[PDB]
Design an enzyme around this catalytic site. Sequence first.
Site, mmCIF file in Angstrom:
data_model
loop_
_atom_site.group_PDB
_atom_site.id
_atom_site.type_symbol
_atom_site.label_atom_id
_atom_site.label_comp_id
_atom_site.label_asym_id
_atom_site.label_seq_id
_atom_site.Cartn_x
_atom_site.Cartn_y
_atom_site.Cartn_z
ATOM 1 N N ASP A 26 34.795 47.151 48.790
ATOM 2 C CA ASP A 26 35.623 47.141 49.436
ATOM 3 C C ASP A 26 36.853 46.843 48.123
ATOM 4 O OD1 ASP A 26 38.248 45.648 51.390
ATOM 5 O OD2 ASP A 26 37.387 43.761 50.462
ATOM 6 N N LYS B 46 39.998 47.370 47.340
ATOM 7 C CA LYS B 46 41.482 47.467 47.938
ATOM 8 C C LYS B 46 42.477 46.727 46.651
ATOM 9 C CE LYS B 46 40.743 42.965 50.574
ATOM 10 N NZ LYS B 46 40.619 41.910 51.323
ATOM 11 N N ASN C 299 42.018 43.130 45.730
ATOM 12 C CA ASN C 299 41.052 42.762 44.439
ATOM 13 C C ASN C 299 41.395 43.129 43.075
ATOM 14 O OD1 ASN C 299 39.801 42.785 47.213
ATOM 15 N ND2 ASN C 299 39.119 44.177 47.023
ATOM 16 N N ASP D 125 36.922 39.455 43.743
ATOM 17 C CA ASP D 125 35.907 39.892 44.152
ATOM 18 C C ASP D 125 35.518 39.925 44.846
ATOM 19 O OD1 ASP D 125 36.227 38.768 47.475
ATOM 20 O OD2 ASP D 125 38.422 40.048 47.395
ATOM 21 N N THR E 256 37.697 46.861 54.472
ATOM 22 C CA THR E 256 39.331 45.421 54.940
ATOM 23 C C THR E 256 39.884 46.719 55.793
ATOM 24 O OG1 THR E 256 40.085 44.857 53.099
ATOM 25 C CG2 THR E 256 41.463 45.908 54.343
HETATM 26 C C1 LIG Z 1 35.544 34.481 49.477
HETATM 27 O O1 LIG Z 1 36.995 33.833 50.161
HETATM 28 C C2 LIG Z 1 37.556 33.621 49.839
HETATM 29 C C3 LIG Z 1 38.181 32.404 49.493
HETATM 30 C C4 LIG Z 1 39.532 31.871 48.049
HETATM 31 C C5 LIG Z 1 39.964 33.236 47.808
HETATM 32 C C6 LIG Z 1 39.593 34.378 48.269
HETATM 33 C C7 LIG Z 1 40.084 35.599 47.461
HETATM 34 C C8 LIG Z 1 39.545 35.824 46.448
HETATM 35 O O2 LIG Z 1 38.495 36.769 46.480
HETATM 36 N N1 LIG Z 1 40.449 35.675 45.197
HETATM 37 C C9 LIG Z 1 40.371 35.528 43.988
HETATM 38 N N2 LIG Z 1 41.111 35.379 42.838
HETATM 39 C C10 LIG Z 1 40.450 35.597 41.753
HETATM 40 C C11 LIG Z 1 41.359 35.456 40.409
HETATM 41 C C12 LIG Z 1 42.923 35.223 40.589
HETATM 42 C C13 LIG Z 1 43.540 35.250 39.920
HETATM 43 N N3 LIG Z 1 42.812 34.863 38.411
HETATM 44 C C14 LIG Z 1 41.571 35.351 38.030
HETATM 45 C C15 LIG Z 1 41.152 35.365 38.834
HETATM 46 C C16 LIG Z 1 39.188 36.014 41.370
HETATM 47 S S1 LIG Z 1 38.432 36.639 43.059
HETATM 48 C C17 LIG Z 1 38.745 34.477 49.071
#
Ligand SMILES: COc1cccc(CC(=O)Nc2nc(-c3ccncc3)cs2)c1
Lengths: 390, 393
Positions: free
Chosen positions: A193, A195, A198, A211, A232
């Site tokens: 995935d 995109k 990510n 992610d 996606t």
């Molecule tokens: C699978 O369910 C979710 C739940 C919350 C958020 C997300 C999206 C996601 O995976 N968001 C991520 N955000 C970071 C991050 C953000 C900021 N700085 C460092 C890492 C790492 S994975 C998916």
Amino acid sequence: SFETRFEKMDNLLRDPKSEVNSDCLLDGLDALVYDLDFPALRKNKNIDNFLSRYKDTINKIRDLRMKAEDYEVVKVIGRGAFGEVQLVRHKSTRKVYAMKLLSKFEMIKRSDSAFFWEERDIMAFANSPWVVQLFYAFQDDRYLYMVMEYMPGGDLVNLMSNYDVPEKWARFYTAEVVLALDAIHSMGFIHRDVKPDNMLLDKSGHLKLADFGTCMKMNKEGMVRCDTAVGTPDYISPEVLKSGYYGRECDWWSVGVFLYEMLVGDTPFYADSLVGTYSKIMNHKNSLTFPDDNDISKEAKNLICAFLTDREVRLGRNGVEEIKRHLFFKNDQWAWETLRDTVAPVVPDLSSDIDTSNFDDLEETFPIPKAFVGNQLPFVGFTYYSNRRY
Amino acid sequence: MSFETRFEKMDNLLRDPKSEVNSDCLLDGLDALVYDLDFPALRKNKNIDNFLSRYKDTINKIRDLRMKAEDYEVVKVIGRGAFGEVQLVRHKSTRKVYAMKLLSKFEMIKRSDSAFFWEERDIMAFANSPWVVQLFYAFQDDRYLYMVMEYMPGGDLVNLMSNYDVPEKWARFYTAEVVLALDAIHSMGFIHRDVKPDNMLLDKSGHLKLADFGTCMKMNKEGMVRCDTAVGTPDYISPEVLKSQGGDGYYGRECDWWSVGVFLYEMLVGDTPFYADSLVGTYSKIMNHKNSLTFPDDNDISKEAKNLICAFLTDREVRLGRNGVEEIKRHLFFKNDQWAWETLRDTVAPVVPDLSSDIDTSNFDDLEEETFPIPKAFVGNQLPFVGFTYYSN
Ligand SMILES: COc1cccc(CC(=O)Nc2nc(-c3ccncc3)cs2)c1
Ligand SMILES: COc1cccc(CC(=O)Nc2nc(-c3ccncc3)cs2)c1
């Protein structure tokens, strides 16, 4: 030998990669105590006595081990499918991190994956400047927590939505994504995935992938046999979409889509309905077109098309070096071997260790069981704390 | 506390042999769960099925690597008790010789009684006294609890008494050693409750050690212990411990001195002071100690011994030892020229065992397995034994 046995058994409680290390062991007891503390189950004495016995002990364990109340939540920096990500400050250390919360109730209610497992391993052990780092993983009766390094630069979706990306910048970002994906492929995974969502930017504006929800381990012949489509709607490769047996080539399809969107402004297969996007993808042969853009260089168009072809003729079917050798990347500002040491096209100007300017503005569980449900069993061993790889 | 301190404290908790959550107890918890969930009716639930299927390969490795019963070669069954049997064994690898007390997990759960073994484990494991039999390893399985102790080749005091008309000089030695032994247990914060010659064991040198700390219990703030538990074979039981049935009754260490008096009596007289055909008759005689305690018409018992026996065979409120061990120690019965309290165990015991081998069982008399039913739902039969495992170094 008696000695050999106690040594082998000893390394098993130390190894962070072990299923029975102190981290899993503690989780297992903590799980039992949670999954049994209900009056209907407590009607059984074996249960009542076990709980009453470990009561004072399990509470000490609970307070000593990492808990969510150890963190002061600064801002909810994101929201996803099964939870929310949040900029936090560890109350004791006063250290700043990005914390991904995953609702144990939500996942259990038809999750069908156990996706968080490789998301944990990849981030915890990658040891790459291209992968976001996991420092701690811990849990409770409701959530799974991932304590990762905060990416203050925000995601590529934010960059793209605030700039008409010049080709010189797109070259940098594409190149970094190639290095980043290669690192994951080297770890044996297919990202499945890729995109802009990510793609995360550090304090310096350099890239990191985040992610790895969709990640899967490649088999002996570098293939994955997933019977159902994953990803996606716009970035999905036609092979993945139809499924199926496929290789790392699918992540290159996505790179092409990302390069297109940066330079053109929209996704190459965008259509009103998501079903229309799917339709356009399957007909990539006749649907891929470029606007009257005097800016899109011949090489960029060639690269986009080299990635936006059928698997069998895709650039990258013969490895990264054929992608790397592409004329699109031919430049005088950086060398592949030293690209992340060069100075980023957008260096974030940040106000504090908690500057959230690159993140858009933001702000129930299982019932009481009649009998033994074992709801906390699929999460035993998720903790990365007592036995980590320092 | 700091984050570092908090991490380190949690680390010492998986190392501490005295800890409820050290690696071995934790392994037990998982091992139990795997045993108590591997049934088709429970496996119908996926959370359960997946958990088991996941840890399958792992838990088996754990099972083979950790101490198992098949690590020991059984030499002779040196004894049999209510919930199992004791056996002289030889650890196959180390080729070391030990005493191994087995306890049937099915029998304990069946008979409601499934916790007496805790204070037995802790006492033997951590006493670190020449008066307490030593626990080297405690381990388990789906069927038994195992206690690997140092073997007492001298046998028990019941055997000595049945082979000799104990002279008073010997009785003095044995009584004195028992006083030192009980004091050590009391110091650890425990009352024995049903002391007897059966629990008095003799080493390679003929010196005493206490064993079988089943009836054992830990004292509260005021050095007292409350109980309901019906107690059988009342011969050595103190009238306060007998009075206590249903929870009505808080008693102190004074009860173990009553038992010393009974032991001193039996050694010199030949029978128990309150013996009667029926167990109810023994109980009856005990409650009426005031009028039932009598001595035979042969000049043989010394005045001091009679006084000591009677000083211990009185109501709690006037018992010798109500004001501590030093008042027992000061008793004229002990006044002697062969030993000093401070050096008694360094003296040459009255009966030194002459033994033929490291496995000489001459001081030990010559000596179907029911199984748990499958459970329709979660029974948790293994739960009352989580954390029983202990290893030494
Ligand atoms: C699978 O369910 C979710 C739940 C919350 C958020 C997300 C999206 C996601 O995976 N968001 C991520 N955000 C970071 C991050 C953000 C900021 N700085 C460092 C890492 C790492 S994975 C998916
Ligand atoms: C009620 O449960 C049982 C089960 C089996 C045996 C016994 C009796 C008993 O507890 N016997 C003991 N024997 C030693 C010993 C014997 C010889 N050498 C060292 C230790 C330590 S406890 C009680």
